[PDB]
C-alpha cells in the first residue's frame, strides 16, 4: 500500500 516510514514496508 503506501506506508512511508523506516525499514521495509510491503503493501
Amino acid at each position: 500500500x503506501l506506508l512511508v516510514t523506516a525499514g521495509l514496508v510491503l503493501a
Epitope: 503506501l2 506506508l3 512511508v4 516510514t5 523506516a6 525499514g7 521495509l8 514496508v9 510491503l10
Partner: antibody, heavy 126, light 108 residues
Framework: EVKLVESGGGLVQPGGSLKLSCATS????????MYWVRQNSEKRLEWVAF????????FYADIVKGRFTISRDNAKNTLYLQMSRLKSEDTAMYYC???????????????????WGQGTLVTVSA | DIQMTQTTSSLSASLGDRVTISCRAS??????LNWYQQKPDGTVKLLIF???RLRSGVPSRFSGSGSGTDYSLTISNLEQEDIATYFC?????????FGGGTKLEILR
C-alpha cells in the same frame, strides 16, 4: 521529468509568519508523500515536516512542532509550509521533496527525499 | 536522534582516481543509509539508497557498502562532473539525520 518548485522566501521579522509553496508537475501529486527539508549557512541539512498524500497525517520535527503547519491542495499540485512564530534559527534554504518506495525482493524501501526542488531562502531578521 | 559523522569534510583527488567518502553512525543503522549529491548550485539528487543500491540514471562508478555503523561511497574514476558535496543520511529511526558533508575538490 518531475518538477518541484518552491516559492515564498524573503525577510521576516522574528515573531513573523511567511508561507511557502511548492508547485509539483510531471507526476500524480495525490499519490506521493510530500516533505520539507532545510539547510542553513553552515550547510547542515534538517528535516522539518511531512504530510501524507491524503492530507490526513502531518508529522513534525520537534524544533518546529507547534509553530509550523504543513498542508497540501491536491487539486492544484501545490504543497505548503505556513511558518509562524519564526525565530532567527529558522533562517535557511527551504527545500521540498517527494517520497519513493523502491522495490526490494522482500519489502519496499521508503526513501523520503527522492526528488528535491531548487529551494527558497528565508532570512529571519529585524 | 542518531548522529551521523562524516570523517572528512573536504578531500581533493585527481581525475581518474578512486575516492571513498566515509560515514559513521552512532548506532547500528541496519543498512538503511542513503547518499545524496548537492552540487555547487544548491541542486540535490539521490545517488544510492539501502546502502549499496544505486538509483537509475546514476553512474556505475558510484558504489556504496556498509554494515552496522560504517558506510562508504566509492567513486570509481573521478570525472570532472563529480565536484559537489556528498551527504549520508540514515533512515533507521525518526528523525532522518544527515551527516555534515564531504566536499570534493579536484586536484589539477
Amino acid at each position: 521529468e518531475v518538477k518541484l518548485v518552491e516559492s515564498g522566501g524573503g525577510l521576516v521579522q522574528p515573531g513573523g509568519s511567511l508561507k511557502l509553496s511548492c508547485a509539483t508537475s510531471g507526476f500524480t501529486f495525490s499519490d506521493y508523500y510530500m516533505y520539507w527539508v532545510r539547510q542553513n549557512s553552515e550547510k547542515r541539512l534538517e528535516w522539518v515536516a511531512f504530510i501524507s498524500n491524503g492530507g490526513g497525517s502531518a508529522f513534525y520535527a520537534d524544533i518546529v512542532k507547534g509553530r509550523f503547519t504543513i498542508s497540501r491542495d491536491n487539486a492544484k499540485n501545490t504543497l505548503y509550509l505556513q511558518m509562524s512564530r519564526l525565530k532567527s534559527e529558522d533562517t535557511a534554504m527551504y527545500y521540498c521533496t517527494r517520497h519513493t518506495l523502491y522495490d526490494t525482493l522482500y519489502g519496499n524501501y521508503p526513501v523520503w527525499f527522492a526528488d528535491w526542488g531548487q529551494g527558497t531562502l528565508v532570512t529571519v531578521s529585524a | 536522534d542518531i548522529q551521523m559523522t562524516q570523517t572528512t569534510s573536504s578531500l581533493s583527488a585527481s581525475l581518474g582516481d578512486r575516492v571513498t567518502i566515509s560515514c559513521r553512525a552512532s548506532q547500528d543503522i541496519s543498512t538503511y543509509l542513503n547518499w545524496y549529491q548537492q552540487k555547487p548550485d544548491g541542486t540535490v539528487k539521490l545517488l544510492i539508497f539501502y546502502t549499496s543500491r544505486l538509483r537509475s540514471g546514476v553512474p556505475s562508478r558510484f558504489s556504496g557498502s556498509g554494515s552496522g555503523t560504517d558506510y562508504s561511497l566509492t567513486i570509481s574514476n573521478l570525472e570532472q562532473e563529480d565536484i559537489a558535496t556528498y551527504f549520508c543520511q540514515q533512515g533507521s529511526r525518526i528523525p532522518p539525520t544527515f551527516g555534515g558533508g564531504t566536499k570534493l575538490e579536484i586536484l589539477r
